């Protein structure tokens, strides 16, 4: 009752980590569809509250929600009061469900809109260099432009299925 | 070796430059072959046409694609 590759049980006979068996892809494929139909049925019925989203804007990722502010370190060429849509959404999550992009979510599934409320310069930044015993010293001051956005709304649509 | 790197337009690092595979150019490459990474240029769609010059993109595989659509493949 021993096969050619049978090893009596010792500390090093088998790996320490437990053996894991993944689900059958076929049986798992239809279970995934049931979870997507359940979450999609929660969006049509509006069974969700406040939403947060992770948007990629200005080479940077922001964890944003409604009626919150973000400070951008450059000029956008937009009048104060103009309403725009943030196109790249990596993640939109609720209390009971979360949607992830690969790497970006579809435009027909989430819509984030913001508004420009302030265009202003940063506070003066000191740039000074010094080297000892070399009469090396120079000072510079810079004021980077800034733009403040207010996230207006985060709404989703039932387009999963 | 510093002078050859300037002749080949390799001042800035990790900046692909295209050269011809000929003896004279290869000879300069054999002098700095320990400072560079050489890879052949592949043309799966062929040479860029005049209507594709602004739609190209050099991938990490070495292929030059003439249709950069930036959209998931429907396949």
């Amino acid at each position: 009752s021993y096969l050619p590759g049978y090893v009596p049980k010792t500390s090093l006979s088998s790996p320490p980590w437990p053996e894991v068996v993944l689900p059958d892809p076929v049986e798992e494929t239809r279970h995934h569809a049931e979870v997507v139909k359940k979450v999609n049925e929660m969006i049509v019925t509006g069974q969700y509250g406040r939403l947060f989203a992770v948007v990629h804007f200005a080479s940077r990722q922001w964890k944003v929600t409604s009626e919150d502010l973000i400070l951008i370190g450059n000029e956008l060429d937009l009048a104060c009061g103009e309403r725009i849509r943030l196109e790249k959404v990596l993640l939109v999550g609720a209390d009971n469900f979360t949607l992830l992009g690969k790497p970006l979510l579809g435009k027909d599934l989430v819509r984030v809109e913001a508004t420009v409320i302030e265009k202003t310069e940063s506070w003066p930044r000191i740039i000074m260099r010094f080297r000892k015993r070399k009469n090396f010293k120079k000072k510079r001051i810079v004021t980077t432009p800034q733009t403040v956005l207010r996230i207006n709304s985060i709404e989703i649509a039932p387009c999963l299925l | 070796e510093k002078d050859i790197i300037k002749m080949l337009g390799l001042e800035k690092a990790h900046t692909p430059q295209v050269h011809k595979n000929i003896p004279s150019v290869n000879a300069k490459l054999k002098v700095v072959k320990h400072l560079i990474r050489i890879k052949p240029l592949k043309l799966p769609q062929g040479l860029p046409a005049e209507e594709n010059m602004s739609n190209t993109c050099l991938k990490s595989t070495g292929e030059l694609v003439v249709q950069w659509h930036l959209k998931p493949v429907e396949q």
Partner: protein, 43 residues
């Protein structure tokens, strides 16, 4: 205890330096690149 006479990394009696494992791998990674460079410079 443990004085290295003079400056550490110069002279006759230096502080010994030993080759780690990643230092070996780092050098081998460079070699594999330049070995493939010899192949494309051959046609």
């Amino acid at each position: 205890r443990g004085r290295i006479p003079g400056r550490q990394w110069i002279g006759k009696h230096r502080r010994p330096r030993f080759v780690s494992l990643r230092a070996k791998q780092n050098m081998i990674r460079r070699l594999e690149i330049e070995a493939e460079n010899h192949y494309w410079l051959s046609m």
